[PDB]
């Protein structure tokens, strides 16, 4: 039969799901979580062969190794070994939508391994094999004999091999199918790969075994008393001498223990479970678990005899915590949580979707290091090790079932179909059966983007019945259906409603008070970090903090799903949709992370970190008020550093330790600060530093900061009188001003400064001209698919209006000789099809000091789309190594994403003034700059700017960052005003009104000089 084309058959001869087992045969080894000789890893080099379809697989393969097969490493995704192309499609299914059928051309991966077992495993006991991850379906053979079949690429499939094992060499044969009916439930926006991408192992258990166990913790009103209730289930022959003992450990101390024979209480007219027993342990003043302080206990479950003989032991870490929704609030150990989360896929630039401990630890450290306290398993059960790390490092987790049918029409066609309830149910139930003992998991999720069907309600209720300890949520069908305890929309904006029919996305503040609504609101997804994004991020946090029931959300998302390819020379580059011949494909939509595929941060990460700080500050006079947003921990590893500076010049500082309790305040009085009479603005910058290193951070780690303007003393002194006076030389074609060894040349035909000289060295490679456009950011383009011409998108509106093709018509270009300077006045009008888009009026004043004062006043037609920017740009001949400036920095910041930037004197290498977004666009800008220094140049004013070796044009025409070439000289963009980058989503205009350049008339001035 073709079991991969029948949702009625999701497995064959597969063992029941259960919590992580190791079948320890020694209680001390179990308590310390040390290795168990009964659990073996079969990871390593396997024999692999690729085929176009399962029909092409030679039967001989079942009996012996095919000489054509290659020796590859397992786990792995065969697209990563180059056997075929990984595919990046977002919504549209990778295969023709015709359930339950799949294409006859079904890439088949044939894996095989020769191995042998310990003599004792042949004598007695149950030997089972475990495949943590097989994408997407597979058949299994042992020593030529068929064992079973399994589906669901994200949960373990186990099979009893006891009756197939033989002395000597044994051979596993695994036929993996890329496509199956299960693929209809795995349409997540990500790379479509396949193979055995997760661990493979052998577990040896006794015939009379622990087949399952559940750990629960209930508390009293103040959590000073708890009861640990453990239900243990067994398989095999029941016998009166059998006992179960559950002991609770805190380090090497046993705080509580419980022993009892099998035989549960009576549950109905036929009695109770003779094969189960529930132990109840009293725990006084338990140490509570939270992301803040991940206190953990160790629970050891022993199946032994009444007279002391251990049969086998299983165990897990225990975190005493209560998760409950009360009066509209999500409470953890009685406190309202504020979710600082992120959605994280299991992605690796080299290994594809194969995860490893090192990578997970790296993600967790970066996350906590950037003030995240939660993560969503978008959109499937993760690698088993992820939960252990979260339990221990401290991260709230949303465990999500591997069910996504985004590409269906309507989205709920399958999920509302009773005939898919079985397949759907196993993806939900097997997840809960596997992860329910993990304390880090505080919320169960029924999946992602599958509309809202009756199957969702059925499964919602099942969980509620089986595990009342955790709330259940699901966004599909409107984010507030009868299948979710939490209003969990994706991309709902703060103040703006999006009244979509049927599934509107109300402003989150409004959503809360809709007639009858009482549930808490936590976005399952928000702040789409695709490329230069996260504009308006602070708006979300201001709302989260002011509204009790707005309890945060999970950013989308953690890491760019870009893959690594190599060119002719063997140099690596970041590839995305379509770069593998995969088509249809959705281009760069697979990259929406706060970090690059190699975990290098994007500028946006700093903004998230800043807005997600755990300490709030207020300033009044000499007093700084520090408020703690921690719910449980006291600030026992923090000291406040404060420094006052005048225009970047340090003037005073000092440190004060932080002794603030959760939700508490601390008043800090700053001493008398010297009185600077020197013109300038005084700035106060404070930062919280962690003097001691921790499991997730180094000593000196900065966890928060904030800036304030103190006193400002305006300059009322005039500059030194000009000894000399510049001379003007006229020509029909040019206006030349000369002073000392400096020369300025204004082209009378274009009306632009076309050249400058310091001695005989040219300064410009391209004239200084106005600029009202920018290389479109992913948010300006707006498309979740590589096949959509959207006229509503900003980039499209700018093209239709001719912003990118507007030619500068000169209206006026005059020159006047003044008492101590030359005044050049110009006026241009950018038009397109007889329509004047903008009008620019300027005056250039050059005095005897050699300083060029540029005054600019622009007019923007009210009926033309608001411009991307209002400023000037040119290509300097110069190419220096440093960029020194007095403004917001040191990292890239934009109008609607600069709260994390600080005002000060920054000095960086030129390359750092460039942000390597895989998909090139406007980047590296820095706002609130009062002074910019490059080479012999200095510009003064109050402007925004970016500077690099790439022109706006090149960035605009280049698809991949690796294809960018450094242009001659340096490109400079000085903006008086720049449009917001937005980010609420990346497929519709998202730049908030206050950040759109719509004033109609703009003014800004600059001073250009040398030295």
Indicate which residues carry an active-site annotation.
449, 525
Residue with Cβ nearer Na ion (494 or 728): 494
Binding a copy of itself by CB under 8 A: which of 23, 455, 771, 851? 455
Tell me the backbone φ, ψ of residue 117, rounded to 5 degrees: -115, 165
| Residue of the chain from 9, 228, 728, 964 that contacts Mg ion (CB under 5 A) | 9
232 contacts a copy of itself (rule: CB under 8 A): no
Provide, rounded to whole angstroms, the least separation between the CB of residue 530 and Mg ion.
14
Minimum distance between the CB of residue 272 and a copy of itself, rounded to whole angstroms?
5
Rounded-to-integer distance, Cα 696 and Cα 367, Å: 9
Q: How far apart are CA 556 and CA 590, in angstroms?
A: 11
Closer by beta carbon to Na ion, 387 or else 491 = 491
Does position 534 interact with Mg ion (CB under 5 A)? The reply is no
Select the residue interacting with a copy of itself from 395, 408, 441, 631 (CB under 8 A): 408
Residue-by-residue DSSP string for 759-783:
TTEE-EEEEEEEE---PPPHHHH--
270-279 long-range contacts, Cβ below 8 Å, gap at least 24?
273/233, 274/238, 275/233, 275/234, 275/235, 275/238, 276/231, 276/232, 276/233, 276/234, 277/231, 277/232, 277/244, 278/229, 278/230, 278/231, 278/232, 279/229, 279/230, 279/232, 279/244, 279/245, 279/246
Residue nearest to Mg ion (CB): 406
Min. distance of Cβ 502 from a copy of itself in angstroms?
5
In whole angstroms, how close is the CB of 17 to a copy of itself at the nearest point?
8
| Residue 723 site contact among a copy of itself, Na ion, Mg ion, none (CB < 5 to 8 Å, cut-off depends on kind) | none
Name the residue with tokens 């109609």. 1000
Least distance to Mg ion, CB of residue 140, Å: 14
Could you say whether residue 740 binds a copy of itself (CB under 8 A)? Answer: no
Minimal distance in Å, beta carbon 961 to a copy of itself? Answer: 32
Q: Considering only residues 261-300, where is the footprint of a copy of itself by CB under 8 A?
A: 265-274
Using CB under 5 A, which residues numbered 187 to 226 contact Mg ion?
Answer: 189
C-alpha dihedral sign at 385, 386, 389, 392: negative
Residue 482 binding: pick among Na ion, a copy of itself, Mg ion, none (C-beta 5-8 Å cut-off by kind): a copy of itself
> 946 with 923: CB under 8 angstroms?
yes
Per rule CB under 8 A, is residue 461 in the interface with a copy of itself? yes
The interface with Mg ion within residues 151-190 (CB under 5 A) comprises 181, 189
Sign of CA dihedral 391, 395, 399, 402: negative
Residues contributing to the site for Na ion (CB under 5 A): 189, 544, 550, 589, 592, 635, 638, 657-658, 920
What are the phi and psi torsion angles at 993 (to 5°)? -45, -45
Cα 858 to Cα 828: distance, rounded to the nearest angstrom: 9
**Interaction pattern, residues 582-621, with a copy of itself; x per rule: CB under 8 A:** ----------------------------------------
C-beta of 212 vs 770, nearer to a copy of itself: 212
Residue 638 contacts which entry, Na ion, a copy of itself, Mg ion, none (Cβ below 5-8 A, type-dependent)? Na ion
Residues 6+ apart with CB under 8 A from 274: 238, 262, 263, 264
Which of 10/532 has CB closer to a copy of itself?
10
Q: Which one of 29, 229, 292, 457 is in contact with a copy of itself (CB under 8 A)?
A: 457
Exposed, middle or buried, 510 (CB in 10 Å: 0-12/13-18/19+)?
middle
Least distance (Å) between residue 776 CB and Mg ion: 24
Between 889 and 920, CB nearer to Na ion: 920
DSSP string over 747-758: ETTTTEEEEEEE
* Positions 446 through 475 that interact with Mg ion (CB under 5 A): 449
Q: Nearer to Na ion by C-beta: 93 or 544?
A: 544
Number of chain positions touching a copy of itself (CB under 8 A): 57
Residue nearer to Na ion on the CB measure, 242 or 337: 337
Binding-site size for Mg ion (CB under 5 A) equals: 7
Q: Which stretch binds a copy of itself (CB under 8 A): 60-68, 446-454, 604-612, 944-952?
A: 446-454
Determine if 156 is a binding residue for a copy of itself (CB under 8 A).
no
DSSP code for 473: E
With CB under 8 A as the contact rule, which of the stretches 199-207, 421-429, 749-757, 873-881 interacts with a copy of itself? 421-429
Those residues whose C-beta lies under 8 Å from the C-beta of residue 632, and which sit 6 or more positions away, are 288, 290, 292, 293, 333, 335, 662
- Please identify, among the stretches 500-508, 651-659, 849-857, 959-967, the one whose residues bind a copy of itself according to the rule CB under 8 A: 500-508
Nearer to Mg ion, 317 or 607 (CB): 317
Q: Is 421 one of the binding residues for a copy of itself (CB under 8 A)?
A: yes
**Binding marks (x or -) toward Mg ion, 663..702, rule CB under 5 A?**
----------------------------------------
What residue 502 binds from Mg ion, Na ion, a copy of itself, none (CB within 5 to 8 A, per partner kind)? a copy of itself
Q: Least distance from C-beta 783 to a copy of itself, angstroms?
A: 16
Give which of a copy of itself, Na ion, Mg ion, none residue 831 binds (C-beta under 5 to 8 Å, depending on kind). Answer: none
Extract long-range pairs of 228-231: CB within 8 Å, 24+ residues apart: 228/256, 228/280, 228/281, 228/283, 228/299, 228/318, 228/320, 229/278, 229/279, 229/280, 229/281, 230/258, 230/278, 230/279, 230/280, 230/281, 230/299, 230/301, 231/264, 231/276, 231/277, 231/278
Task: Supply the minimum distance, in Å, between the C-beta of residue 478 and a copy of itself.
Answer: 8
Q: Terminus-to-terminus CA distance in the chain, angstroms? A: 81
Taking residue 741's Cβ as centre, other Cβ atoms within 10 Å add up to 12
Phi, then psi, of 20 in degrees rounded to 5: -50, 125
SS3 string of 205-224?
Answer: ECCCEEEEEEEEEEECCCCC
Which stretch, 59-67, 223-231, 308-316, 451-459, contacts a copy of itself (CB under 8 A)? 451-459
Note if the bond before 379 is cis, omega within 30 degrees: yes
Distances (CA, A) of 531 to 559, 596, 986: 11, 10, 9
Min separation Cβ 965 and Na ion, Å: 14
Looking at the Cβ atoms of 524 and 686, the one nearer to a copy of itself is 524
The interface partner of residue 181, options being a copy of itself, Mg ion, Na ion, none and the CB cut-off 5 to 8 Å by kind, is: Mg ion
Residue-wise over 880-891: b if at least 16 C-beta within 10 A, else e?
beebebbbbbbb
Residues between 402 and 441 with contacts to Mg ion, criterion CB under 5 A: 406
User: What count of other Cβ atoms lies within 10 Å of the Cβ of residue 444?
Assistant: 27
Burial code (b: 16+ CB inside 10 Å, e: under 16) for 819-842 equals ebbbbbbbbbbbbbeeeebbbbbb
- Unique residue bearing structure tokens 């001209």: 769
Q: Which of 281, 626 has the CB closer to Mg ion?
A: 281
When the beta carbons of 95 and 594 are compared against a copy of itself, the nearer one is 95
> Which one, of 650, 711, 707, 654, lies nearest residue 679 by Cα?
711
User: Looking up tokens 């996305």, which residue turns up?
Assistant: 505
Instruction: Answer whether 861's CB lies under 8 Å from 832's CB.
Output: no
Helix (H, G, I), strand (E, B) or coil at 928: strand
Supply φ then ψ for residue 434, to 5 degrees: -90, -35
If contact means CB under 5 to 8 A according to the sort of partner, which of Mg ion, Na ion, a copy of itself, none does residue 503 touch?
A: a copy of itself
Which region, judged by CB under 8 A, interacts with a copy of itself, from 9-17, 56-64, 823-831, 887-895?
Answer: 9-17
Cα separation, 119 vs 488, in Å, equals: 54
Cα gap 223→295, rounded to integer Å: 14
State the pairing for strand pair 335-336/329-332: antiparallel
Check residue 101 for interaction with a copy of itself (CB under 8 A).
Answer: no
Query: At its nearest, how many Å lie between Na ion and the CB of residue 960?
Result: 9
Q: Per the structure block, which two tokens stand in for 470?
A: 């955790």
Residues that bind a copy of itself (CB under 8 A): 1, 6, 8-12, 16, 265-274, 406-413, 418-419, 421-422, 425-426, 429-430, 433, 449, 451-452, 454-455, 457-462, 464-466, 476-478, 482, 500-503
Residues that bind Mg ion (CB under 5 A): 3, 6, 9, 181, 189, 406, 449
């Amino acid at each position: 039969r073709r079991d991969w084309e029948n949702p009625g058959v999701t497995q064959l001869n597969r063992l029941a799901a259960h919590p992580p087992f190791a079948s320890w045969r020694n209680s001390e080894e179990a308590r310390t979580d040390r290795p168990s000789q009964q659990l073996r890893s079969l990871n390593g080099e396997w024999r692999f062969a690729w085929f176009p379809a399962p029909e092409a697989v030679p039967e001989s393969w079942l009996e012996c190794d095919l000489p054509e097969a290659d020796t590859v490493v397992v786990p792995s995704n065969w697209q990563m070994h180059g056997y075929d192309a990984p595919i990046y499609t977002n919504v549209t299914y990778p295969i023709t939508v015709n359930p339950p059928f799949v294409p006859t051309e079904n890439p088949t991966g044939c894996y095989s391994l020769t191995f042998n077992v310990d003599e004792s495993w042949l004598q007695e006991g149950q030997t089972r094999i475990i495949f943590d991850g097989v994408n997407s379906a597979f058949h299994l053979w042992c020593n030529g004999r068929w064992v079973g079949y399994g589906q669901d690429s994200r949960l373990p499939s186990e099979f009893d091999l006891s009756a197939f094992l033989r002395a000597g060499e044994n051979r596993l044969a695994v036929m993996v199918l890329r496509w199956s009916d299960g693929s209809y439930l795995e349409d997540q926006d990500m790379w479509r790969m396949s193979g055995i991408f997760r661990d493979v192992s052998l577990l040896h258990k006794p015939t009379t075994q622990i087949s399952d166990f559940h750990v629960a913790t209930r508390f009293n009103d103040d959590f000073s008393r708890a009861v640990l209730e453990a239900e243990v289930q067994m398989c095999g022959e029941l016998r009166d001498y059998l006992r179960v003992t559950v002991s609770l450990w805190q380090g090497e101390t046993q705080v509580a223990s419980g022993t009892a024979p099998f035989g549960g209480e009576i549950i109905d007219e036929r009695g109770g479970y003779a094969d189960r027993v529930t132990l109840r342990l009293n725990v006084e003043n338990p140490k509570l678990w939270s992301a803040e302080i991940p206190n953990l206990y160790r629970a050891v479950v022993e199946l032994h005899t009444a007279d002391g003989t251990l049969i086998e032991a299983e165990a897990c870490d225990v975190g005493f915590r209560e998760v409950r929704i009360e009066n509209g609030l999500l409470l953890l150990n009685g406190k309202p949580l504020l979710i600082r989360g992120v959605n994280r896929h299991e992605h690796h630039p080299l290994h594809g979707q194969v995860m490893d401990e090192q990578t997970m630890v790296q993600d967790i450290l970066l996350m906590k290091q950037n003030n995240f306290n939660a993560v969503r398993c978008s959109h499937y059960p993760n690698h088993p090790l992820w939960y252990t790390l979260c339990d221990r490092y401290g991260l709230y987790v949303v465990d999500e079932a591997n069910i996504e049918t985004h590409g269906m029409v309507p989205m709920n066609r399958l999920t509302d179909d009773p005939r898919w309830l079985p397949a759907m149910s196993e993806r939900v139930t097997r997840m809960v059966q596997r992860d329910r003992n993990h304390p880090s998991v505080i919320i169960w999720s029924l999946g992602n983007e599958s509309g809202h069907g009756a199957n969702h309600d059925a499964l919602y209720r099942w969980i509620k019945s089986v595990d009342p300890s955790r709330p259940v949520q699901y966004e599909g069908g409107g984010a507030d259906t009868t299948a979710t305890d939490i209003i969990c929309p994706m991309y709902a904006r703060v103040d703006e409603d999006q009244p979509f029919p049927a599934v509107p996305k109300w402003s989150i503040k409004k959503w809360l008070s809709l007639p009858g609504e009482t549930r808490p609101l936590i976005l399952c997804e928000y702040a789409h970090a695709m490329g230069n994004s996260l504009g308006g991020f602070a708006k979300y946090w201001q709302a989260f903090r002011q509204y009790p029931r707005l309890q945060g959300g999970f950013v989308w998302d953690w890491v760019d799903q870009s893959l690594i390819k190599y060119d002719e020379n063997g140099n690596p580059w970041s590839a995305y949709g379509g770069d593998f011949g995969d088509t249809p494909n959705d281009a760069q939509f697979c990259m929406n992370g706060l970090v690059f595929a190699d975990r290098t941060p994007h500028p946006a990460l700093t903004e998230a970190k800043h807005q997600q700080q755990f300490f709030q500050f207020r300033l009044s006079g000499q007093t700084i008020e520090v408020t703690s947003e921690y719910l449980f921990r006291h600030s026992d590893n923090e000291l406040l550093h404060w420094m006052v500076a005048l225009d970047g010049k340090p003037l005073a500082s000092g440190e004060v330790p932080l002794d603030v309790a959760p939700q508490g305040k601390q008043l800090i009085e700053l001493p008398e600060l010297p009185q600077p009479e020197s013109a300038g603005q005084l700035w106060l910058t404070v930062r919280v530093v962690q003097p001691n290193a921790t499991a997730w951070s180094e000593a000196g780690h900065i966890s928060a900061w904030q800036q304030w303007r103190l006193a400002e003393n305006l300059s009322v002194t005039l500059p030194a009188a000009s000894h000399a006076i510049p001379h003007l030389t006229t020509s029909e074609m040019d206006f030349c001003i000369e002073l000392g060894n400096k020369r300025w040349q204004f082209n009378r035909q274009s009306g632009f400064l076309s050249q400058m000289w310091i001695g005989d060295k040219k300064q410009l490679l391209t004239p200084l001209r106005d600029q009202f456009t920018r290389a479109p950011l992913d948010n300006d383009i707006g498309v979740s698919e590589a096949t959509r011409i959207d006229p509503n998108a900003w980039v499209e509106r700018w093209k239709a209006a001719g912003h990118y093709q507007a030619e500068a018509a000169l209206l006026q270009c005059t020159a006047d000789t003044l008492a101590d300077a030359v005044l050049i006045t110009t006026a241009h009008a950018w038009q397109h099809q007889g329509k004047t888009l903008f009008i620019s009026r300027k005056t250039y004043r050059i005095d005897g000091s050699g300083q060029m004062a540029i005054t600019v006043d622009v007019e923007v037609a009210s009926d033309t789309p608001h411009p991307a920017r209002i400023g000037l740009n040119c290509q300097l001949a110069q190419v220096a190594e440093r960029v020194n400036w007095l403004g917001l920095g040191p990292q890239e910041n934009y109008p609607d994403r600069l709260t994390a930037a600080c005002f000060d004197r920054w000095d960086l290498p030129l390359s750092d003034m460039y942000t390597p977004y895989v998909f090139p666009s406007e980047n590296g800008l820095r706002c609130g700059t009062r002074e910019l220094n490059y080479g012999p140049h200095q510009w003064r004013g109050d402007f925004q700017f970016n500077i690099s070796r790439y022109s706006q044009q090149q960035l605009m025409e280049t698809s991949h960052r690796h294809l960018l070439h450094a242009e001659e000289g340096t490109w400079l963009n000085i903006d008086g005003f720049h449009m917001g980058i937005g980010g609420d989503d990346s497929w519709s205009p998202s730049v908030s009104a206050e950040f759109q350049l719509s004033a109609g008339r703009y003014h800004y001035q600059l001073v250009w000089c040398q030295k």
